[PDB]
Amino acid sequence: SQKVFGITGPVSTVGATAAENKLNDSLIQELKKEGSFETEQETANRVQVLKILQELAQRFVYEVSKKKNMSDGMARDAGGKIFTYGSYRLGVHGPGSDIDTLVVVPKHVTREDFFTVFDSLLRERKELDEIAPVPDAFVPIIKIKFSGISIDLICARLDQPQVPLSLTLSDKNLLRNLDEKDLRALNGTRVTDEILELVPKPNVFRIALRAIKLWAQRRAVYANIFGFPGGVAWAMLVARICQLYPNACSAVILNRFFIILSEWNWPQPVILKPIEDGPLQVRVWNPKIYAQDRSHRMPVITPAYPSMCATHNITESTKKVILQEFVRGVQITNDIFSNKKSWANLFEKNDFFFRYKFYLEITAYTRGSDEQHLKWSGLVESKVRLLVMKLEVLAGIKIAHPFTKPFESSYCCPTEDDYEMIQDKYGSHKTETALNALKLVTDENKEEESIKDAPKAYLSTMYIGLDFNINKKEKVDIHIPCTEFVNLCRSFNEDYGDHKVFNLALRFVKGYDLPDEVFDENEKRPSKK
């Protein structure tokens, strides 16, 4: 009831002034200019797509229930229901945004049914242009594009005979007798549903969140895999501030959001309500019981039972960046509120590739199918974080800052020799021009009877910016951490040791000698100081 004001009640209950609303109006307007919002039309399409999927979910269940020899009535009554979660469910999605979707089915519908029956029902539709089923994923999923709109579909199987249209997923007992995959599948929806019910004024929250997502992206502090808060974390952080200021407008919320998160007594958790127990043998976030939990540095806790920490990955170095960025938020928003800066300023692109003197490139190379490369580089990427952690503990390392995005390229690679060379010359601007000799495969140039044919080599590169501690005279030695990292890129139940195909290289590089790929059309690379 008072749940909407969070665990300490409001900080202030005073509503917005006119001067505040004007600055809110210009925010929404900046958000519009920046293309946060899709038109009413493309939202209308989204709604219609889910309708069709809702119809198909009901059909799916109906058909399976007929196969188990229920009557017509019982098959209909068995129901089946579509829920959204993540960005779309929250009202913060953008023009290109995927809809994260969950199909809920009664006890007698398996996921083997989902990957056969539901799959073939999807294939029947004219609106279906692409479908990628991935049964053996950590969460089993079907990725589709439907009427140009991207949908991610997951399946949850309840311990219940029927899933009526009226079903909401908020009751704890919906979790009884579920296996871990099903348990996991329910969580996304229950979490985002609860955030929505834990917020005083949802439209105010929606706008504040749109602002935070843009900022986080542009300031390069949005990437879970690399040790920054992802979407749900940011959503919950924004939700927390909304509770402290129930009547504030979004402009004000952003202001108070940067001040409070920058003065937060970190590692004390941000929580949207008191963490709860339940009847199940499932791990709840609990720093008292679990050493892992205790080591979280900026914990942001999901509210749906099993409460979990949505920022496990944050490292000492990423917390430093996040905190700098909040402190920057504090100065810019106060300036906006003083008529001295615009919102455009807050959303100014980061300058990661100008801010340090040295960088550590980490490159995954593949000479093979792009499916092989996806796998190989996906593996390498997931460890970058672990490298950050080994480096950041070292005496001479002031910070190890991972950038939040890989740099992808690919070349036609007719021979083994071309492949040695790509490996040799790539990554330094001194030698980078050597690979113009090899046709650079372009997002805009993929003539299938020429380019999309030749044996191709793929590169993915992550960058860690470095700051050293140096009034001391010595060679800074970081080979152990780099070597340990390499050995972490270990072939689990698949092999990457055939260097004729996969490779891994790290390279230490001075700022001025950074690869071109790293600078935009409008950026001029730095030079020898």
Binding site: K357, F358, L360, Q423, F468, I470, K475, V476, D477, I478, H479, C482, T483, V486, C489, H499, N503, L504, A505, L506, R507, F508, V509
Partner: peptide
């Protein structure tokens, strides 16, 4: 000109994973 060692190879600023065992 700061010296930073990331590998024990011929080029201390370059670590190629397949050569790792041939360095040390």
């Amino acid at each position: 000109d700061l010296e930073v060692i990331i590998s024990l190879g011929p080029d201390p600023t370059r670590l190629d994973a397949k050569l790792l065992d041939s360095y040390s």
